[PDB]
């Protein structure tokens, strides 16, 4: 529980998309983890950013939870994928349990 | 030692707001360790954010140690909401020691 | 593998700067872990930061490897030297392997 997504990616996006984008993490990570959302945090914060040899558009995700985990992972990219349209094969996500 | 906190906020703040607090954190990592304030980095960097239903002021800390607990918690959130005006119950801290 | 730098830094520097450091930032993760440079991923963001009793450059970096370390220290400093002029004094390094 105290689940938390924070992103940092190089996607060019407006301050109310992050915040939407922020909303429906939180009830992402409710649903995944069970525990409530008034208890789920995320954050969207902008970088500059290179994958490989092209600055391409990519993420990097710390999730934290105070603690069967693929499930975390496609439900995080999919919703970043939904939101700044980022190819699942340029998110990186770190488990800090 | 080696103190370092990097606070993610949604924040409204001038740059000079954020250099007074990092300035103050880094006198307050230094008396809750003991380290020389020479030794504590502080950052703070703003980011869209929501926590629970809302995208009201939140933060996110990130404590690093190299190396009885809560005594850095209440200090680290006792400087937040003195800088932001944050309230304690929207301030997650992740130790990593 | 699957190695990350992440360095947060209150350098000025342009977007195209710090597009630079981030794929010389990538070759050299590639060069000191032997992953191909296709895998690699690195970042910088801007911060309002304090180091000891001064707001003077510095930067905070977190590498992650998915996982005999001065090697990437040097390697990674090295860079932020050439890119920001950073000393290296004021450069902290967090692995989280
Ligand atoms: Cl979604
Ligand atoms: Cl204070
Ligand atoms: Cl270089």
Chains 1, 2, 3 share one sequence.
Do not use: W
Not at 61 to 68: E, H, M, Q, S
């Amino acid at each position: 529980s105290m689940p938390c997504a924070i992103v940092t990616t190089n996607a060019d996006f407006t301050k109310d998309q992050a915040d939407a984008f922020c909303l429906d993490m939180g009830q992402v990570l409710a649903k995944e983890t069970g525990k409530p959302v008034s208890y789920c945090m995320a954050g969207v914060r902008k970088a500059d950013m290179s994958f490989g040899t092209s600055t391409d558009l990519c993420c990097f995700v710390d999730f934290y939870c105070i603690g069967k985990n693929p499930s975390i992972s496609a439900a995080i990219t999919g919703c970043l994928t939904q939101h700044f349209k980022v190819k699942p094969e340029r998110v990186y996500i770190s488990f800090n349990e």
